[PDB]
C-alpha cells in the first residue's frame, strides 16, 4: 500500500498507488470505475476490502 506497483487483481493488469478506500460496494461488486469508464477502485479477493 501507498507504493507505486504493477498490480494484477483477478486478471486486471494495471499500474498504480494502492490506498485503503472509503468507498462501500454492495456485496456482488468486485471492481469500480470513474466517469471516463476507467478503473478507480478494486476489491481484494482474499481479505474483502
Amino acid at each position: 500500500k501507498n507504493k507505486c506497483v504493477n498490480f494484477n487483481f483477478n486478471g486486471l493488469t494495471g499500474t498504480g498507488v494502492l490506498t485503503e478506500s472509503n468507498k462501500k460496494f454492495l456485496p456482488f461488486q468486485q471492481f469500480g470505475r470513474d466517469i471516463a469508464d476507467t478503473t478507480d477502485a478494486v476489491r481484494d479477493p482474499q481479505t474483502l476490502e
Binding site: G16, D34, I35, A36, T38, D40
Partner: peptide
C-alpha cells in the same frame, strides 16, 4: 461558473497570472 483524465498522459497547466493577480489588475 462551475469547473480520471490524468493517467492517459493528458494534463492541465496553470495560468501564469493567478486569480489574485487578475483581481489586482482589475
Amino acid at each position: 461558473v462551475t469547473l480520471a483524465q490524468k493517467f492517459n498522459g493528458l494534463t492541465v497547466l496553470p495560468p501564469l497570472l493567478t486569480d489574485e493577480m487578475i483581481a489586482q489588475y482589475t
